[PDB]
Amino acid sequence: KNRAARVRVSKGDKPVTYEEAHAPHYIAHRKGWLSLHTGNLDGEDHAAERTVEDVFLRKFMWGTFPGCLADQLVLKRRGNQLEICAVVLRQLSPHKYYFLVGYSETLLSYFYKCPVRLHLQTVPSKVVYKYL
Amino acid sequence: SFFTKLTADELWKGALAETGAGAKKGRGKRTKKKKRKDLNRGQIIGEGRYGFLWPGLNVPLMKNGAVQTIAQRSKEEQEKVEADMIQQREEWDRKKKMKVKRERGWSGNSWGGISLGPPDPGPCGETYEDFDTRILEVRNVFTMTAKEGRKKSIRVLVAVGNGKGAAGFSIGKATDRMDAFRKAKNRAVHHLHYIERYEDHTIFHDISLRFKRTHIKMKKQPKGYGLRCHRAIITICRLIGIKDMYAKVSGSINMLSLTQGLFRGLSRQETHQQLADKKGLHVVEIREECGPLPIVVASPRGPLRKDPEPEDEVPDVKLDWEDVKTAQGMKRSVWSNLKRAAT
Amino acid sequence: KVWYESPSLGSHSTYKPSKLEFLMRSTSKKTRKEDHARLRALNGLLYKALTDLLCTPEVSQELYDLNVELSKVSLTPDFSACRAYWKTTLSAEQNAHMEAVLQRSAAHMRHLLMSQQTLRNVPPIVFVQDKGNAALAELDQLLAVADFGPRDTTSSSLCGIDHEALNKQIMEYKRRKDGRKRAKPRLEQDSSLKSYLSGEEVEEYECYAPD
Amino acid sequence: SRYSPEFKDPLIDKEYYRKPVEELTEEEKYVRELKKTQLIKAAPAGKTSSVFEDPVISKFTNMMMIGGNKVLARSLMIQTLEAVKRKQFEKYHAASAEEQATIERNPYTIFHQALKNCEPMIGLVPILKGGRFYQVPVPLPDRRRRFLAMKWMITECRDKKHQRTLMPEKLSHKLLEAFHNQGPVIKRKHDLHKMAEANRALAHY
Amino acid sequence: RQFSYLIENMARDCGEYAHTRYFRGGMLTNARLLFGPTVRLPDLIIFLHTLNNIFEPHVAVRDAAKMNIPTVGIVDTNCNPCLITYPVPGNDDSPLAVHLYCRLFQTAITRAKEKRQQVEALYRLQGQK
Amino acid sequence: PRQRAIQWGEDGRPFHYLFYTGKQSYYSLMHDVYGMLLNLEKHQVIGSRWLIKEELEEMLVEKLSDLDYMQFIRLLEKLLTSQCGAAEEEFVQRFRRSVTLESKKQLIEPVQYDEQGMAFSKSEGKRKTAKAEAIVYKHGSGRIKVNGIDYQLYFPITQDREQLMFPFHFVDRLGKHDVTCTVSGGGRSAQAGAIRLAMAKALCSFVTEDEVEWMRQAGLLTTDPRVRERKKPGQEGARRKFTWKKR
RNA sequence: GGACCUGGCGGUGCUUCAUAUCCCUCUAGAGGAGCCUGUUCUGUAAUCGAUAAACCCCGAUCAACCUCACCACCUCUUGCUCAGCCUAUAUACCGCCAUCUUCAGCAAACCCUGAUGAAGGCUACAAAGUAAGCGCAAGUACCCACGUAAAGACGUUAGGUCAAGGUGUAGCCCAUGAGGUGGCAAGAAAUGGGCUACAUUUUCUACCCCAGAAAACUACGAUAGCCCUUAUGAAACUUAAGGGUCGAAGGUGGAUUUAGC
Ligand SMILES: [K+]
Ligand SMILES: [K+]
Ligand SMILES: [K+]
Ligand SMILES: [K+]
Ligand SMILES: [K+]
Ligand SMILES: [K+]
Ligand SMILES: [K+]
Ligand SMILES: [Mg+2]
Ligand SMILES: [Mg+2]
Ligand SMILES: [Mg+2]
Ligand SMILES: [Mg+2]
Ligand SMILES: [Mg+2]
Ligand SMILES: [Mg+2]
Ligand SMILES: [Mg+2]
Ligand SMILES: [Mg+2]
Ligand SMILES: [Mg+2]
Ligand SMILES: [Mg+2]
Ligand SMILES: [Mg+2]
Ligand SMILES: [Mg+2]
Ligand SMILES: [Mg+2]
Ligand SMILES: [Mg+2]
Ligand SMILES: [Mg+2]
Ligand SMILES: [Mg+2]
Ligand SMILES: [Mg+2]
Ligand SMILES: [Mg+2]
Ligand SMILES: [Mg+2]
Ligand SMILES: [Mg+2]
Incomplete structure (x- = not known):
C-alpha cells in the first residue's frame, strides 16, 4: 500500500486541510505547487540551489513563527525577489507579528542576498477541508 | 546537521510507537510507556539562553513613553529566570500528579459498582440528571475472525435508576471500554422499569422466582434492616430506592440472569391496593410493635364483599426448606448473620 | 418437522418462480437455505409431468410409439429455459427419428404443459440429447468416412537421487582435500x-484596538 | 483493444454493396440501414478488395512469418506459388496430349487442394485417468481442421531433415506431394486417424 | 396491496397520513436519525390490516408499543390483538369491509376536526365580547 | 447543492400525507401513476430514452434504490401500452429525455480549383506516427506521386502499393484520378496506411453519397487508433512481464 | 465434563467459475552449449541487507583508489559538530514499501432480533435495518467515451528496511569513535535471470527490400581466451572501445517451466 504523503482514514475526528487531504497523485490535478520558480523548467539552471533554499525557509519560518502557521508556506520567486506567503493564526499579539516580519525579512534578505518580503494572512482557526 | 532535523509531531509519532504490529494486537504491553509531552507549552517566544531582551517580542516595546533598546539580562538575573522556569516545570508536573482519586467498586480491580454519572442529555434538550448509573459487569469478549484472528471487544452491563422506583439496565458492546459505557447507560434510560415499593423502602411481599438457572428469593423487611443481598442486588436496590430487603441467590450466579431476573421479579409484585381491588376486601396490617391495633393499608375502590374469605384450616402453599430450617433453629452456618458495613 | 428443515419464517409466502420475479430482485439477495429446496422439488415435478406425456398415447401417436425415456430434467434458476435429457438409441438412424419428432412435439408439449395450471408458466423446454454418448456415435460417423490410408537418460533419476552430480561434488571436495x-x-x-x-x-469578549 | 465495443468489423466486399435493393430481404434491408448508424473499424492493411485476394494464402503467409517479417514471409509464399507453377508447366510440356488434360497448372488450385488433403477429420486429446494419461478421440471443428493442415505443412518444411534446401523449393515439393495424396504430411493425417481408431474404446470419456 | 391506493386517498382526504409501503426498519424506533431530531411521531396509528404479506404481525404493531403510541387495528380471526390498544374484530379481506372501515374513520376524523374549529371559533367570539 | 426544505411546520405536523414513508416524493409519484392507470380502465423510441436513476433522483430530490427505479419505469411502460390520452402524454414526457444521435455520415471535403482550372479535393490521414496529406484531382490517368516520386518507386513493397489501390479499386475508379501526396513520419507500412486514409477522404468528394457510405462500412474512412503502447516500469514490455523466477 | 458459537482445517458436498487463465488449445521462450550477471556453498586476515509465493542485474539509474560500512598495520583523544557510533533491537518506531489487490469491501454513530447468552440483522408482489466517512466508482493524465497508466480502503504476513535519514530503549566514550597506508572480493562446484548461438525465413557485401557471393573441420558460432592499440583517470594483467590472433562447446535442448488477447 502506498504511504507517501497520505493522511490515513481514522474514526472521522481528524481535521485535515485541503493540502493534507490530497495524496501526491493529485499534484497538478487538484492541488498546485507550494513553490514556484524557474529552476525546474527545461533549459533552466540552479534547481539544486532553489531546492535547498526552499527547504531552509520552511524550517526557518516554522521555528520563527512557532505555533502560528496554519498551513504550508507558499514561496514565490520573481526575478531576484523572494516572496513568502503564510497563513497564520490570530493568537500572537500584532506587535509580535510585526516584530517577526521585520526581523525575518531583514535576516533572510542578508542571508540570501536578495530582497525578501513576507506576506501574512491571518485566520481565526486552521481551515478544515474534511474530517478523516 | 540542520537539514536532518524533524518536527515535534514526527519525533513523537516515532518515539511513542502507537502505530505498529505491537499496537495493532496489543502484542506489546506497557508497564513502562513513553508519554507524549508538549515542549512548546511553557516556552515564550523571544526567550533564549543568552537572556537578550528584544523590544516588542519578549519585553514591552515602549518604556516611559520611549522605545526600549536591545538589552541583555545579567548573568545573575538570567540564572533566576532559568531557575524559575525549572521550578515552574515541576509545579506543572506536580499539578498533573495531583489527580482526584475515584472510589473503588466491589473490589479494587473490579469495575462492578462504580458510578458512571447520569446519562448524557438527549438530542431534544432532554436531561437525566436525576438518574445514577452503576456498572454491574465489564467483560472482555474475544471473537475469532476470518482474517484477523482473535479480536478483543468489550461487553458492559450497566444499571440506571433515579432512586424513586424508576430503574433499568442495558448491555453495551464496543471495541473501546468507554464507548460500551456510553451505549449501555444511554440505552438503559430508554428501557426503564417502574418498581413499586412498600412505604417507599421495601418490596410489597416475599418474591421467589427462577430466571433460567438463577434463583432469587427476596424477603420483605422492616425499616432499619438494610440491604442484605448479593452485592449486585445492593447496587440495583440503591438505584431503585429499596432500603430494606433480604435476598438470596442460588444456582447459577450469572450477572445478566441475576440482573434481568431481579427486574422481572420486582416488576411483577402485587401491591396492597391491587390485592384489595382484586379481592374486594380490606387489607389490614398487624404490627407487633403496634400490638393488636388493626391498620388498614388498602381498601377496595369498588364494592366491598360481604362474604368472609374462606379460612382453609391448612394452606397448601409450598415452603422453602431453608426458611423452615432457620425458624426451627436447625440452620447452622458460620457465614450467616455476620457483621458487615452499612449497606 | 423432520431433520429436513422446515423452520422458515416465511413458510406461508407464495412461491413465485417466474421470469419477471428474477428481474425485480435485490442484487445483494442470495439464495436462502430452503430456497434451493423449492427449486430441487419444482424441477422434479417437471420430470414427473414430462414422463407421463411420453407414455400416454392420447398426447400423440408418434410420441407414444417412440417410447422415449427421460434421463434427466433440471429447470434453470433463471426461469428462462428448461433442460430435459432423453436417452439415445444405438441406431443413429433411429436417433434421427426420435429427435425430429421430439423437436416438433416440444412446441405442442409446452402448451400441453400449460394445461397444468399449477405450472402454467413453463419456460421453453430444451430437449437436450445426452446420456447416450451422442458424441460417441458422432465420432463413429466420422471414423468410417475418415481416410486411414494404405493399411500395413540417467538411471540416477530412477533411483531418486542425482548420484552423478553428488559423486562429482564429493570428488571436487576431494580435489581440495x-x-x-x-x-x-x-x-x-x-x-x-x-x-x-x-x-x-487531562486539564470571550473581543475589542478593536484592545488593551 | 483501442476500439470501443461499439466498433464493428469492416465488410470489404464490393459485391455486397452493388447488390440491387429489390433482391434484398426485409432482414437484409434492416442490417444495411443499421450499419449506417454504427462505428466501423479501420480496414487492416493486410486485406483489400483486390480480385486476387486469397484469405487462405494470406493465413498461410502469416503462419510462416517470423518476428513480424511479412515482407520475407510474403516473398517465400510468392516464390512457392511460382515454383509450383513452373514445376507443372515442365510436367505439362513433357507429357502427352492425353496426360496433359489431367495436369493442373494453377498453383492456387494445387495449394488449396493440397491443404484439403491434409485436414484431419478427427483428433486426439490427452486425458488424465487414475494418475495415468490416456488420449481420447474427438471430432475436430472446421477451424481446427484447417489450422492443423497448415501447421503440419509449415512444420514439415522447417524440419532439420531438409539440408540447405530453400523454403520455396521445400514447400513447393511438399504441396505437390500432398496434392497427390502422398508425403509425410499426409502420413501425419493418416496416422492421426489411425491412432483415433485404436482409442475408440476410450471415447466414452 | 389490493387497498394501498384506497387507503392513501382516504388519508389525504381526511388530512392524515398513510404508510402502505414496505415498512423500513426503525421508522418509529429510529425516527430521529431517519427524519431528524425534531421530527414529531404519530400520536395514533390505525391499522386496517395488522398482518404483513408473509402472514406475520406488522412490525409497526410492536414498534408502536415500544414508542408508546396507541394503535387502532382491524383484527381478523388469524390476527394477534394483544398489543393493539383498540382492536376491532372484523373482516379485513373483503373489499366491502375495508371500504366501510375507511368511510367510518374518514368520517369520524373529518367530523372531529370540524368540531374543533366550531368550538374554537365560538370560544373566541365569546371571548372578545 | 440543492437542499430539501423542511417537511413539517411549527406544530410538527408534516405537510405531505406520505411523510412517514420516508420517500414521500417517490411514493407520491407512484400513487399518481397508479391512479391514472385505474382511470383509463374505467374509461376503456429512436429519438427518446428513459431518464437515468441519477436524473430521477434529482426530479424527486430524494435517494432511490436500483429496484425503486425499475419499478417506476415498469409502471410508465405499462402506461404507454394503454390508450393514453393527451393528459397521460405530457406526464410521461416529463420523464423522457431526448437522446442525441451523432450522424455517421462522412464529411465531404470541398472541391477546389487550381490555377489551370482543374478540380481537386484535399484531405489528411494519420496512421501510427505517419501523417499524410493527399490531393486527389477530379480527372486524371491514374498517376500517384508520393513526395514527388512515382508510387511504385516510393513504395517498392507490393503490400504498400496494394493499400494505395484499395480506395480506388473499391469504388471502381482505377485510372481516373491523379494524386499528389506528401507523407512524413512512421515506417513504410504506416506511411502507406496514412496515404490510404488521406486519398480515401479526398476521393469522397467525387463519388456518390451511397458510395461514400460503402467506403465507410469497408473501413476506408476510419482513422486507425492502434498506436504503440508505452512500456511500463517493472516489466519487460508493454505487456510482457519479466520471467517469474523459478521457485 | 455437557450444550452451543466462532475461527481454522477437511485425501469435505453441490452449483457456477477463472480469459493470457487452473487444464487442453495458440505464439515465442526457459530447462542442454558458451558467455554476462545474481545468489548459494566453498575459500579469504577481510563487510552488510534481501533471501517461498512477495529473494536471487535485489538496496546499486552500478564497487580499480574514492565510494566503504570490511581486513591488517600505524596514528589521534573535548575530537567537522554545545562531540561521535553503519553498535544491539525492523519483535519499540516514524519514514517509504512488498503482499493478497489481475480484490470490494471497511466502518463511526444509532436501531431492532435472540427471554437483553456468545451472536444476528436479507427476501422488491420485500419479512429490520438506517448509516456519515474511506475504498471501489466517478473524475483527471496519455492519442477518444476505448486502452494503458495512475489510483487501490480496512486488514493479512510482529512481511522488508535501525545501513536513506530521523528516532525510543540498551550499549561504547584512550574506543564498538575519528584519520592514514596497503589490501580483500577467488571458484572445486551448484543454481537463478539474461545475452549470443546452434544457421538457409540463414552468413557476407551493396542497398535499405527486383542484386551478387557464401554455405560443414578455412561454413554457421565468443560480447570468451591470448597479444596490441586507444579512451577516461594520478593510478587500468584489471574498466570500456577497437584491431589482430584464435575458430571452442553448440547441430534447437528430458521431467519441468515463464510471458503474451
Ligand atoms: K467452520
Ligand atoms: K532453451
Ligand atoms: K514497518
Ligand atoms: K533507521
Ligand atoms: K536505533
Ligand atoms: K573506529
Ligand atoms: K538463462
Ligand atoms: Mg504498488
Ligand atoms: Mg487493591
Ligand atoms: Mg383477514
Ligand atoms: Mg517484445
Ligand atoms: Mg542454460
Ligand atoms: Mg551477500
Ligand atoms: Mg540475512
Ligand atoms: Mg532481516
Ligand atoms: Mg518471505
Ligand atoms: Mg575499496
Ligand atoms: Mg564504525
Ligand atoms: Mg515488520
Ligand atoms: Mg476510461
Ligand atoms: Mg499500476
Ligand atoms: Mg479509481
Ligand atoms: Mg520480522
Ligand atoms: Mg582503503
Ligand atoms: Mg575477441
Ligand atoms: Mg594514459
Ligand atoms: Mg568462420
Whole structure:
C-alpha cells in the first residue's frame, strides 16, 4: 500500500486541510505547487540551489513563527525577489507579528542576498477541508 | 546537521510507537510507556539562553513613553529566570500528579459498582440528571475472525435508576471500554422499569422466582434492616430506592440472569391496593410493635364483599426448606448473620 | 418437522418462480437455505409431468410409439429455459427419428404443459440429447468416412537421487582435500481501571484596538 | 483493444454493396440501414478488395512469418506459388496430349487442394485417468481442421531433415506431394486417424 | 396491496397520513436519525390490516408499543390483538369491509376536526365580547 | 447543492400525507401513476430514452434504490401500452429525455480549383506516427506521386502499393484520378496506411453519397487508433512481464 | 465434563467459475552449449541487507583508489559538530514499501432480533435495518467515451528496511569513535535471470527490400581466451572501445517451466 504523503482514514475526528487531504497523485490535478520558480523548467539552471533554499525557509519560518502557521508556506520567486506567503493564526499579539516580519525579512534578505518580503494572512482557526 | 532535523509531531509519532504490529494486537504491553509531552507549552517566544531582551517580542516595546533598546539580562538575573522556569516545570508536573482519586467498586480491580454519572442529555434538550448509573459487569469478549484472528471487544452491563422506583439496565458492546459505557447507560434510560415499593423502602411481599438457572428469593423487611443481598442486588436496590430487603441467590450466579431476573421479579409484585381491588376486601396490617391495633393499608375502590374469605384450616402453599430450617433453629452456618458495613 | 428443515419464517409466502420475479430482485439477495429446496422439488415435478406425456398415447401417436425415456430434467434458476435429457438409441438412424419428432412435439408439449395450471408458466423446454454418448456415435460417423490410408537418460533419476552430480561434488571436495511460555489471552493484565481510579485530569469578549 | 465495443468489423466486399435493393430481404434491408448508424473499424492493411485476394494464402503467409517479417514471409509464399507453377508447366510440356488434360497448372488450385488433403477429420486429446494419461478421440471443428493442415505443412518444411534446401523449393515439393495424396504430411493425417481408431474404446470419456 | 391506493386517498382526504409501503426498519424506533431530531411521531396509528404479506404481525404493531403510541387495528380471526390498544374484530379481506372501515374513520376524523374549529371559533367570539 | 426544505411546520405536523414513508416524493409519484392507470380502465423510441436513476433522483430530490427505479419505469411502460390520452402524454414526457444521435455520415471535403482550372479535393490521414496529406484531382490517368516520386518507386513493397489501390479499386475508379501526396513520419507500412486514409477522404468528394457510405462500412474512412503502447516500469514490455523466477 | 458459537482445517458436498487463465488449445521462450550477471556453498586476515509465493542485474539509474560500512598495520583523544557510533533491537518506531489487490469491501454513530447468552440483522408482489466517512466508482493524465497508466480502503504476513535519514530503549566514550597506508572480493562446484548461438525465413557485401557471393573441420558460432592499440583517470594483467590472433562447446535442448488477447 502506498504511504507517501497520505493522511490515513481514522474514526472521522481528524481535521485535515485541503493540502493534507490530497495524496501526491493529485499534484497538478487538484492541488498546485507550494513553490514556484524557474529552476525546474527545461533549459533552466540552479534547481539544486532553489531546492535547498526552499527547504531552509520552511524550517526557518516554522521555528520563527512557532505555533502560528496554519498551513504550508507558499514561496514565490520573481526575478531576484523572494516572496513568502503564510497563513497564520490570530493568537500572537500584532506587535509580535510585526516584530517577526521585520526581523525575518531583514535576516533572510542578508542571508540570501536578495530582497525578501513576507506576506501574512491571518485566520481565526486552521481551515478544515474534511474530517478523516 | 540542520537539514536532518524533524518536527515535534514526527519525533513523537516515532518515539511513542502507537502505530505498529505491537499496537495493532496489543502484542506489546506497557508497564513502562513513553508519554507524549508538549515542549512548546511553557516556552515564550523571544526567550533564549543568552537572556537578550528584544523590544516588542519578549519585553514591552515602549518604556516611559520611549522605545526600549536591545538589552541583555545579567548573568545573575538570567540564572533566576532559568531557575524559575525549572521550578515552574515541576509545579506543572506536580499539578498533573495531583489527580482526584475515584472510589473503588466491589473490589479494587473490579469495575462492578462504580458510578458512571447520569446519562448524557438527549438530542431534544432532554436531561437525566436525576438518574445514577452503576456498572454491574465489564467483560472482555474475544471473537475469532476470518482474517484477523482473535479480536478483543468489550461487553458492559450497566444499571440506571433515579432512586424513586424508576430503574433499568442495558448491555453495551464496543471495541473501546468507554464507548460500551456510553451505549449501555444511554440505552438503559430508554428501557426503564417502574418498581413499586412498600412505604417507599421495601418490596410489597416475599418474591421467589427462577430466571433460567438463577434463583432469587427476596424477603420483605422492616425499616432499619438494610440491604442484605448479593452485592449486585445492593447496587440495583440503591438505584431503585429499596432500603430494606433480604435476598438470596442460588444456582447459577450469572450477572445478566441475576440482573434481568431481579427486574422481572420486582416488576411483577402485587401491591396492597391491587390485592384489595382484586379481592374486594380490606387489607389490614398487624404490627407487633403496634400490638393488636388493626391498620388498614388498602381498601377496595369498588364494592366491598360481604362474604368472609374462606379460612382453609391448612394452606397448601409450598415452603422453602431453608426458611423452615432457620425458624426451627436447625440452620447452622458460620457465614450467616455476620457483621458487615452499612449497606 | 423432520431433520429436513422446515423452520422458515416465511413458510406461508407464495412461491413465485417466474421470469419477471428474477428481474425485480435485490442484487445483494442470495439464495436462502430452503430456497434451493423449492427449486430441487419444482424441477422434479417437471420430470414427473414430462414422463407421463411420453407414455400416454392420447398426447400423440408418434410420441407414444417412440417410447422415449427421460434421463434427466433440471429447470434453470433463471426461469428462462428448461433442460430435459432423453436417452439415445444405438441406431443413429433411429436417433434421427426420435429427435425430429421430439423437436416438433416440444412446441405442442409446452402448451400441453400449460394445461397444468399449477405450472402454467413453463419456460421453453430444451430437449437436450445426452446420456447416450451422442458424441460417441458422432465420432463413429466420422471414423468410417475418415481416410486411414494404405493399411500395413540417467538411471540416477530412477533411483531418486542425482548420484552423478553428488559423486562429482564429493570428488571436487576431494580435489581440495588432496519453546516459550504463552500467556492466556483472558488473563492479560490491564491498567485501565487503575488509571481510572487514580484519576483522569487531562486539564470571550473581543475589542478593536484592545488593551 | 483501442476500439470501443461499439466498433464493428469492416465488410470489404464490393459485391455486397452493388447488390440491387429489390433482391434484398426485409432482414437484409434492416442490417444495411443499421450499419449506417454504427462505428466501423479501420480496414487492416493486410486485406483489400483486390480480385486476387486469397484469405487462405494470406493465413498461410502469416503462419510462416517470423518476428513480424511479412515482407520475407510474403516473398517465400510468392516464390512457392511460382515454383509450383513452373514445376507443372515442365510436367505439362513433357507429357502427352492425353496426360496433359489431367495436369493442373494453377498453383492456387494445387495449394488449396493440397491443404484439403491434409485436414484431419478427427483428433486426439490427452486425458488424465487414475494418475495415468490416456488420449481420447474427438471430432475436430472446421477451424481446427484447417489450422492443423497448415501447421503440419509449415512444420514439415522447417524440419532439420531438409539440408540447405530453400523454403520455396521445400514447400513447393511438399504441396505437390500432398496434392497427390502422398508425403509425410499426409502420413501425419493418416496416422492421426489411425491412432483415433485404436482409442475408440476410450471415447466414452 | 389490493387497498394501498384506497387507503392513501382516504388519508389525504381526511388530512392524515398513510404508510402502505414496505415498512423500513426503525421508522418509529429510529425516527430521529431517519427524519431528524425534531421530527414529531404519530400520536395514533390505525391499522386496517395488522398482518404483513408473509402472514406475520406488522412490525409497526410492536414498534408502536415500544414508542408508546396507541394503535387502532382491524383484527381478523388469524390476527394477534394483544398489543393493539383498540382492536376491532372484523373482516379485513373483503373489499366491502375495508371500504366501510375507511368511510367510518374518514368520517369520524373529518367530523372531529370540524368540531374543533366550531368550538374554537365560538370560544373566541365569546371571548372578545 | 440543492437542499430539501423542511417537511413539517411549527406544530410538527408534516405537510405531505406520505411523510412517514420516508420517500414521500417517490411514493407520491407512484400513487399518481397508479391512479391514472385505474382511470383509463374505467374509461376503456429512436429519438427518446428513459431518464437515468441519477436524473430521477434529482426530479424527486430524494435517494432511490436500483429496484425503486425499475419499478417506476415498469409502471410508465405499462402506461404507454394503454390508450393514453393527451393528459397521460405530457406526464410521461416529463420523464423522457431526448437522446442525441451523432450522424455517421462522412464529411465531404470541398472541391477546389487550381490555377489551370482543374478540380481537386484535399484531405489528411494519420496512421501510427505517419501523417499524410493527399490531393486527389477530379480527372486524371491514374498517376500517384508520393513526395514527388512515382508510387511504385516510393513504395517498392507490393503490400504498400496494394493499400494505395484499395480506395480506388473499391469504388471502381482505377485510372481516373491523379494524386499528389506528401507523407512524413512512421515506417513504410504506416506511411502507406496514412496515404490510404488521406486519398480515401479526398476521393469522397467525387463519388456518390451511397458510395461514400460503402467506403465507410469497408473501413476506408476510419482513422486507425492502434498506436504503440508505452512500456511500463517493472516489466519487460508493454505487456510482457519479466520471467517469474523459478521457485 | 455437557450444550452451543466462532475461527481454522477437511485425501469435505453441490452449483457456477477463472480469459493470457487452473487444464487442453495458440505464439515465442526457459530447462542442454558458451558467455554476462545474481545468489548459494566453498575459500579469504577481510563487510552488510534481501533471501517461498512477495529473494536471487535485489538496496546499486552500478564497487580499480574514492565510494566503504570490511581486513591488517600505524596514528589521534573535548575530537567537522554545545562531540561521535553503519553498535544491539525492523519483535519499540516514524519514514517509504512488498503482499493478497489481475480484490470490494471497511466502518463511526444509532436501531431492532435472540427471554437483553456468545451472536444476528436479507427476501422488491420485500419479512429490520438506517448509516456519515474511506475504498471501489466517478473524475483527471496519455492519442477518444476505448486502452494503458495512475489510483487501490480496512486488514493479512510482529512481511522488508535501525545501513536513506530521523528516532525510543540498551550499549561504547584512550574506543564498538575519528584519520592514514596497503589490501580483500577467488571458484572445486551448484543454481537463478539474461545475452549470443546452434544457421538457409540463414552468413557476407551493396542497398535499405527486383542484386551478387557464401554455405560443414578455412561454413554457421565468443560480447570468451591470448597479444596490441586507444579512451577516461594520478593510478587500468584489471574498466570500456577497437584491431589482430584464435575458430571452442553448440547441430534447437528430458521431467519441468515463464510471458503474451
Ligand atoms: K467452520
Ligand atoms: K532453451
Ligand atoms: K514497518
Ligand atoms: K533507521
Ligand atoms: K536505533
Ligand atoms: K573506529
Ligand atoms: K538463462
Ligand atoms: Mg504498488
Ligand atoms: Mg487493591
Ligand atoms: Mg383477514
Ligand atoms: Mg517484445
Ligand atoms: Mg542454460
Ligand atoms: Mg551477500
Ligand atoms: Mg540475512
Ligand atoms: Mg532481516
Ligand atoms: Mg518471505
Ligand atoms: Mg575499496
Ligand atoms: Mg564504525
Ligand atoms: Mg515488520
Ligand atoms: Mg476510461
Ligand atoms: Mg499500476
Ligand atoms: Mg479509481
Ligand atoms: Mg520480522
Ligand atoms: Mg582503503
Ligand atoms: Mg575477441
Ligand atoms: Mg594514459
Ligand atoms: Mg568462420
